[PDB]
Amino acid sequence: RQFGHLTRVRHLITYSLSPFEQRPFPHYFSKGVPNVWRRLRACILRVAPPFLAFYLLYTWGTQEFEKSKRKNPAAYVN
Amino acid sequence: TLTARLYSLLFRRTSTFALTIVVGALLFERAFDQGADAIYEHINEGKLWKHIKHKYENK
């Protein structure tokens, strides 16, 4: 598929300025950084969980394995 | 007015641009190496052979 036969579009007016008449990385604070946060706090509660969960299991696992090696002070009290 | 002088003289003509990408590179190389080496070597005084050399080449 090429250009000129994608869709039946009507009544949309767009306005844009040359790259040289504007700023590249504008308003890092006014709108920039906020949205970055507007995002970290939007998925953290959806992504983090299973990862955190994984972690606990990784730890439990390693710790347990590393315990089942050491001897029990009482396997021989005689 | 560097930037403006720059554009007019160096960045306007496709020809001029390329030509300063080269002369610009030669100069960048020479300067960027020395500088890096320097920074490198200095963070390692008395460890490099270039430093220990004299002891055995006489000194």
Binding site: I13, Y15, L17, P19, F20, E21, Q22, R23, P26 | T1, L2, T3, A4, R5, L6, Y7, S8, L10, F11, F17, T20, I21, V22, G24, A25, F28, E29, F32
Partner: protein
């Protein structure tokens, strides 16, 4: 009717500080292109290395 249509404001919003009406955009932009191209000129440069 189209006469009823204006171009929104990019003033401040996006325009770099040398762009606000009643002042020729042209005296200030050979300087604006100079910067940009300089950044690009530098990349081609760094890349060659």
């Amino acid at each position: 009717s189209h006469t009823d249509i204006k171009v929104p404001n990019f003033s401040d919003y996006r325009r770099p500080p040398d762009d606000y009406s009643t002042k020729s955009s042209r005296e200030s932009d050979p300087s604006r292109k100079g910067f940009s191209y300089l950044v690009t000129a530098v990349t081609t440069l760094g890349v060659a290395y």
